[PDB]
Each structure stands twice: as structure tokens, then as C-alpha cells.
């Protein structure tokens, strides 16, 4: 019955899946995480997510105590044990327990945890530009998908109070960065632009969509953009594992085009759907 | 006997003190914390620490589900139950569990934890000889991204800094902020002494330290010339003395920065004086546990 959580090789019922309060992952958000979809029995972009996890751990100087290969098998086993076919997966690696101070050298053993949960619109999201700026590349690099997500939560708090489904960050230079958990793209006179990934995160969904754009031969640039570009865009959409491709039909109360998902967004959304149908790593095989 | 840990009113044996993996404090470092010292049956600056806890919670829009008096009582109750007289206290309030996503409105029940342990002075046998400090390449979290004044569960900025100092020959990391101003150590405030004058950064780009506040009180009482002002690398490299402050560390002298000898190479006169006046305060003040 009850969903099981992978916890260091053990499979434990959801309601009992718990970590020592002395884990630095808990005390200090000292760890990294991923987000992964399974569609109809296949895991989409499994190895792109695992590689990013290992990069993020490396950036925080954390050794994940599983080879990448064992990590992929643990993800598939966790899904099998729970009999999932359509699912959202959340791997997490933490520093493990130490003493009460910051020093990671006192933390001999990382915890590895994998959560699995069973699993757009023709309306579109209302996006809100936030006062809080993205974490800076030289303080808490935003490319690290770490458990330090309070930057993102502050932005989400603002979007909640200010009539937004989604918060849009700028960085310190005034460049558009990304949504609180999704990359951003705009479309203007048939050309698509998205920020370079430096001040945001190297999204897997963003990467797939760049591939689709190049398959459709739509003019494309990866270039820094600003408010002026957001407020005069023909279309706007955000991307991420959970949201997939989500049209953004309003920005700060301003209607984007006619307020309905745009042509280019919709083409990308259907090419992206085929891809999630036809490619992935089969769970039951 | 095993140490007990407060968990929403329950007192749980240390080794069974555990948090659901679904708690947003664990998924997202979505909470705040404190650090408090009990010295010989008293809790030093109990109420101040509690005030800061509540301010930090308000900054993250997190409603602590105890009144301040209840929180104080919980801290004292946890210490009593452990028969502790000398302790480090780590209270923690998190957002609790909600959806898997980051939306805090979907999280109905904050989670309140209070750890109490004996825990030696951070530095801990370096107070006679002094710390070797290293300025780090990583800058402090910016005031308009992740305000460094929040004592939050998002401490990877501080940890990245500590990792650099580990690899680069230092006991402590010194942050600058994005302007090039000196900010603080990874876990403590910073003071410098030059020609008899003490300078410390305004707290905006660092953290409003309770120890730093006590030291400033001491500086004023001792009538030492004192300035709260932004400073840079030039000031660090030319200082007669350097020291850092925090609950765990107390007052620690810094005798090397980036391998350069600070004055003498041993704790300065002003630092040692303040260290002595500070020990006195830890003896005469506090809320009685028993
Ligand atoms: C996970 C994440 C993304 C999107 O990444 P995908 O790999 O497409 O799921 C974007 N921004 C932030 C801040 C994230 O945490
Ligand atoms: C807790 C803390 C300090 C020192 O605060 P006190 O109230 O003196 O203990 C300084 N800097 C940082 C980053 C901290 O987390
Ligand atoms: O140890 C830390 O995480 C930061 C500093 C602190 O909490 C303290 O001085 O008690």
C-alpha cells in the first residue's frame, strides 16, 4: 500500500522516512537535489538529471557514495518497488550528520534519499516580476540545484502576494534570470531568445526545448535580455521538469499577445509531448 | 543517560530525534535557527536571541506557533530535562511539510525543534595562539537575494566559504560582499583595531550578532574610540589587531590574514582586554535555568 522512500539502500514507508535533525542537509541545506519525470513506464532524461546531480555535488565538494550507474538503478528500483509508471522523482544527497558547526570535514557519511510520487493549460500562467534578485554567481551560484532554496521561496512569497502563479527573477545586472523554479524563453517577431544559463540553471527541459527549436529551424538566440524584452515579447513560456512547457499569458498584469498560449509555444509543447512519449529509460525491463 | 531534544512539545532521545524528509526545512532549507549559550545554570541573552529568531521568521513570512514566553519556557524546560548547566542551544523553526513544491502556503504546520548539547568554544584551543583567517573568493549572499541578516537554514554560502578556508590554510574564512566591503567570517562578525581605534562593518551586509552587540557595549564602557563603518582589504591588511565574534566562538583573536602576520602574531592588547570583559559578562548575566 503506502509509498516507499529510498533511504541509503533501505526502502522505508513515506510516513516513516525521516532524517536525523543533525544532518547538515537539515541544519544548513547542505545537499543537492534533482527533479525527474516518469511518463508511461519510462524515465525521461534520467542520465542528464543524474549527471547534473553529480556536477552539483562536485561544486559543493560532496562525494555521492554511489557510482552514477548504481544511482540510476536505485532510481529505477524505487519506482518498481512502488509500482509507479507516471511519477515525479526527487533524489537528494546531503552532507550527513557532523557536529553543530558549519565544517563539512566533520561529516563522515552522506545520506542518499529518493522520493517518488504518483503524477501547461490552454489558459496560461500569470507571471510576476519580483523585487528579490536571483542568488549571485559568485555568492551562491544558481546553477547548483542545492537544498538552499530560500531565494526561490522569497520570490514565490512575492508572487503569492502580488497575483502571480509564477515569480520571474532578474539578477544583479538587471538581466532576466529565470522563474523561481523554471527557465524562461521569449518569442519576438518569430525569433526565440532565452538567457544564457550563467545567472540561472542549466535546465534539462530548457536543453530539450533548444533541440526542438533547432529541429524546427526557428531563429534562436541565447542572449541576455531585460524588462524591455519581457514587456514587448509576442510570447513568453517557462520550462522545467514539473511544469514541462508552460505558457505565460500575463506578465505583471500585462497581456502577452492576446492572452492565450502563442503559436510557437504550442508547436514546442506538442513536439515536447512526442519526445516524452518516445524516449526514456524503461522502468520494467 | 541520553540527551533529549524538543520536538513540537515532545522530548525525544537524541538518536531518535528525526525530521520527515517532506519537511520544507529539509527540501529547501525553509526555516530559521539560533545559537545560545548556557553558562553555569544561566542562559546568556536568552530573550535577545529569541527576538532575533522571531524577526528572522517574519522575514521569511513564517509564523512561529509559540509566543515568545512559551519559546523561552521550552528552552529552559529542555535544558532542565537534560540536567544541563553549561550548554549550547540550537532552536530551529521550519516551515514543516506541504506539497513537494516550494509553495509555503501549502504548508500548514511549522515545526519547532530545540537541541541542547555541551559544545566546546568553536575554535576551541586556538584562543591563546590566535586564528589564521583567509579571505575567500566567494562573496557573501547579497542583501537583495538572500539577506545575510536571516539566520536561516540556507547556509551553503557560509559552507562554501568554510570549504575554501579548509583548502587554503585558514581556521576561518573572511567574506567580502559584492561592493568589495568586508562582511564577516563564515559564522562570526569581524572587528579590527588600528592605532587604538576599533572598527566593525555595519550589519547590513552580514548579520546583527548578539555577541557583536555585547562587545560594542563593552567598547563604549571601556571608552575605546569606536566606528561602525565599511572597510576593505586595505584596512584588513594594515590592522594592528583583528578579532571575530559569535555565540559559539565567543571572541576569537585573528593573528594571521592570508598568511600575513597581524601586528605581533599573537593576540593583541585590545582583543585580550575585551575577551576578559566578555567572560565576566557571561558569569554575571543570564536567565536562571533552575
Ligand atoms: C530544477 C530547476 C529548473 C528547471 O530544471 P529542469 O532540469 O528543466 O527540471 C529551473 N530553475 C530552478 C531554480 C530549478 O531549481
Ligand atoms: C549566528 C551568526 C553570527 C554571530 O551571531 P551571535 O548572535 O553573536 O552568535 C555571525 N554571523 C553569522 C553568519 C551567524 O550565523
Ligand atoms: O554555527 C553556526 O552555524 C553559525 C554561528 C552560530 O550559530 C553561533 O555562534 O552559535
From TrEMBL, chain B:
<dbReference type="InterPro" id="IPR005785">
    <property type="entry name" value="B_amino_transI"/>
</dbReference>
<dbReference type="InterPro" id="IPR043131">
    <property type="entry name" value="BCAT-like_N"/>
</dbReference>
<comment type="pathway">
    <text>Amino-acid biosynthesis; L-leucine biosynthesis; L-leucine from 3-methyl-2-oxobutanoate: step 4/4.</text>
</comment>
<feature type="modified residue" description="N6-(pyridoxal phosphate)lysine (covalent)">
    <location>
        <position position="151"/>
    </location>
</feature>
<keyword id="KW-0100">Branched-chain amino acid biosynthesis</keyword>
<dbReference type="GO" id="GO:0009098">
    <property type="term" value="P:L-leucine biosynthetic process"/>
</dbReference>
<feature type="binding site">
    <location>
        <position position="247"/>
    </location>
    <ligand>
        <name>pyridoxal 5'-phosphate</name>
    </ligand>
</feature>
<keyword id="KW-0663">Pyridoxal phosphate</keyword>
<feature type="binding site">
    <location>
        <position position="210"/>
    </location>
    <ligand>
        <name>pyridoxal 5'-phosphate</name>
    </ligand>
</feature>
<dbReference type="InterPro" id="IPR050571">
    <property type="entry name" value="Class-IV_PLP-Dep_Aminotrnsfr"/>
</dbReference>
<dbReference type="GO" id="GO:0052654">
    <property type="term" value="F:L-leucine-2-oxoglutarate transaminase activity"/>
</dbReference>
<keyword id="KW-0032">Aminotransferase</keyword>
<feature type="binding site">
    <location>
        <position position="88"/>
    </location>
    <ligand>
        <name>2-oxoglutarate</name>
    </ligand>
</feature>
<dbReference type="InterPro" id="IPR043132">
    <property type="entry name" value="BCAT-like_C"/>
</dbReference>
<feature type="binding site">
    <location>
        <position position="247"/>
    </location>
    <ligand>
        <name>2-oxoglutarate</name>
    </ligand>
</feature>
<dbReference type="InterPro" id="IPR036038">
    <property type="entry name" value="Aminotransferase-like"/>
</dbReference>
<dbReference type="GO" id="GO:0009099">
    <property type="term" value="P:L-valine biosynthetic process"/>
</dbReference>
<feature type="binding site">
    <location>
        <position position="248"/>
    </location>
    <ligand>
        <name>2-oxoglutarate</name>
    </ligand>
</feature>
<comment type="similarity">
    <text>Belongs to the class-IV pyridoxal-phosphate-dependent aminotransferase family.</text>
</comment>
<dbReference type="Pfam" id="PF01063">
    <property type="entry name" value="Aminotran_4"/>
</dbReference>
<dbReference type="GO" id="GO:0052655">
    <property type="term" value="F:L-valine-2-oxoglutarate transaminase activity"/>
</dbReference>
<comment type="pathway">
    <text>Amino-acid biosynthesis; L-valine biosynthesis; L-valine from pyruvate: step 4/4.</text>
</comment>
<protein>
    <recommendedName>
        <fullName>Branched-chain-amino-acid aminotransferase</fullName>
        <ecNumber>2.6.1.42</ecNumber>
    </recommendedName>
</protein>
<feature type="binding site">
    <location>
        <position position="155"/>
    </location>
    <ligand>
        <name>pyridoxal 5'-phosphate</name>
    </ligand>
</feature>
<dbReference type="GO" id="GO:0052656">
    <property type="term" value="F:L-isoleucine-2-oxoglutarate transaminase activity"/>
</dbReference>
<comment type="function">
    <text>Acts on leucine, isoleucine and valine.</text>
</comment>
<feature type="binding site">
    <location>
        <position position="52"/>
    </location>
    <ligand>
        <name>pyridoxal 5'-phosphate</name>
    </ligand>
</feature>
<dbReference type="InterPro" id="IPR018300">
    <property type="entry name" value="Aminotrans_IV_CS"/>
</dbReference>
<dbReference type="GO" id="GO:0009097">
    <property type="term" value="P:isoleucine biosynthetic process"/>
</dbReference>
<feature type="binding site">
    <location>
        <position position="211"/>
    </location>
    <ligand>
        <name>pyridoxal 5'-phosphate</name>
    </ligand>
</feature>
<keyword id="KW-0028">Amino-acid biosynthesis</keyword>
<keyword id="KW-0808">Transferase</keyword>
<dbReference type="InterPro" id="IPR001544">
    <property type="entry name" value="Aminotrans_IV"/>
</dbReference>
Amino acid at each position: 500500500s503506502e509509498l516507499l522512500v529510498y533511504m541509503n539502500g533501505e526502502f522505508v514507508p513515506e510516513s516513516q522516512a525521516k532524517v536525523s535533525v543533525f544532518d547538515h542537509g537539515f541544519l544548513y541545506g547542505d545537499g543537492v537535489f534533482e527533479g525527474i519525470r516518469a511518463y508511461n513506464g519510462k524515465v525521461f532524461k534520467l542520465y542528464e538529471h543524474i549527471d547534473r546531480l553529480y556536477d552539483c555535488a562536485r561544486v559543493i565538494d560532496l562525494k555521492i557514495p554511489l557510482s552514477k550507474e548504481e544511482f540510476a538503478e536505485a532510481i529505477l528500483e524505487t519506482l518498481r518497488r512502488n509500482n509507479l509508471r507516471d511519477a515525479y522523482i526527487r533524489p537528494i544527497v546531503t552532507r550527513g550528520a557532523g557536529d553543530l558547526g558549519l565544517d563539512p570535514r566533520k561529516c563522515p557519511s552522506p545520506n542518499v534519499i529518493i522520493i517518488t510520487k504518483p503524477w501547461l493549460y490552454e489558459k496560461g500562467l500569470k507571471a510576476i516580476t519580483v523585487a528579490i534578485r536571483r542568488n549571485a554567481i559568485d555568492s551562491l551560484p544558481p546553477n547548483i540545484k542545492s537544498l538552499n532554496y530560500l531565494n526561490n521561496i522569497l520570490a514565490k512569497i512575492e508572487a503569492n502576494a502580488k497575483g502571480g502563479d509564477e515569480a520571474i527573477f532578474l539578477d544583479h545586472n538587471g538581466y532576466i534570470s529565470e522563474g523561481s523554479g523554471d527557465n524562461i524563453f521569449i518569442v519576438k517577431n518569430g525569433t526565440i531568445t532565452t538567457p544564457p544559463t550563467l545567472n540561472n540553471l542549466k535546465g534539462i527541459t530548457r536543453q530539450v526545448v533548444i533541440e526542438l527549436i533547432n529541429e524546427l529551424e526557428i531563429p534562436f538566440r541565447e542572449a541576455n535580455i531585460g524588462l524591455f524584452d519581457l514587456y514587448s515579447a509576442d510570447e513568453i513560456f517557462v520550462t522545467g521538469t514539473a511544469a514541462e512547457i508552460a505558457p505565460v499569458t500575463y506578465i505583471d498584469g500585462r497581456t502577452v499577445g492576446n492572452g492565450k498560449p502563442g503559436k510557437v509555444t504550442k508547436m514546442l509543447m506538442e513536439k515536447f509531448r512526442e519526445r516524452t512519449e518516445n524516449e526514456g529509460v524503461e522502468i520494467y525491463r
